[PDB]
Structure 1
Amino acid sequence: GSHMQTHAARMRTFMYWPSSVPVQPEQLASAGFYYVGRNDDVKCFCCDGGLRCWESGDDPWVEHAKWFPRCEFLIRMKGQEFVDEIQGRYPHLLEQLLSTS
């Protein structure tokens, strides 16, 4: 429950990635991108860790299920079904190490 989804924000993410979104923007709106993401590098709303990296006609969802450490927004039908499946495929989903001293 934050107000980063009002004021203009909604259309502040509805912009684009190259110069228009030739992906599936109706699915993006469910994945937390395009209007439903945040700014340019569609960060998402509830997500603590959303980004974009669009590979080869990939879904917004596998992208937005491989870097999110949490997306309470999307933890609903995706986070109990998606990831339950996606994590089946991703045994390196969880946090590894980085600069942990």
Structure 2
Amino acid sequence: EFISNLSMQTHAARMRTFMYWPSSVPVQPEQLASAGFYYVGRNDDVKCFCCDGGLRCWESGDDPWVEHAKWFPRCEFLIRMKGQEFV
């Protein structure tokens, strides 16, 4: 129910934070932002606007939605978008 970062509630706002995303990181800002993540501005650290979970060390082939569900399966934004079955 409760949203940790209301300023990062829209995907456009989240996508804006990836302005200085390192291009050597092999995961795309558009998929990070769509999966609820915004960039904290250092290294490849991101957080989810809803559950406040953090993820780093993004690997080639990582799916932000799958990684979101692996580590933060009770995130209400995750469940709302992808369904309880996905988690």
Q: TM-score, normalised by structure 1?
A: 0.50
Task: Measure the CA separation in 1 of the matches of 2:13 and 2:42.
Answer: 7
Unpaired runs of at least 5, structure 2: 1-7
Measured on the aligned residues, the alpha-carbon RMSD in Å equals: 4.2
Unpaired runs of at least 5, structure 1: 84-101
What is the aligned residue count? Answer: 80
Q: 1:40 to 1:14 in 2, by over 3 A?
A: same
Range moving further from structure 2, 36-45 or 70-79: 36-45
* Residues 10, 35 of structure 1: 8 Å contact kept: yes
Task: Measure the CA separation in 2 of the matches of 1:35 and 1:68.
Answer: 17
Higher share in strand: 2
Higher share in helix: 2
* Residues 36, 50 of structure 2: 8 Å contact kept: no
Using CA pairs below 8 Å that are at least 6 residues apart, which structure has the higher relative contact order?
Answer: 2
**Rg (Cα) greater in structure:** 1
Listed as ranges, the matches of 1:64-75 within 5 Å are 64-75=68-79
Percent pairwise identity: 100
Task: Measure the CA separation in 2 of the matches of 1:7 and 1:30.
Answer: 6
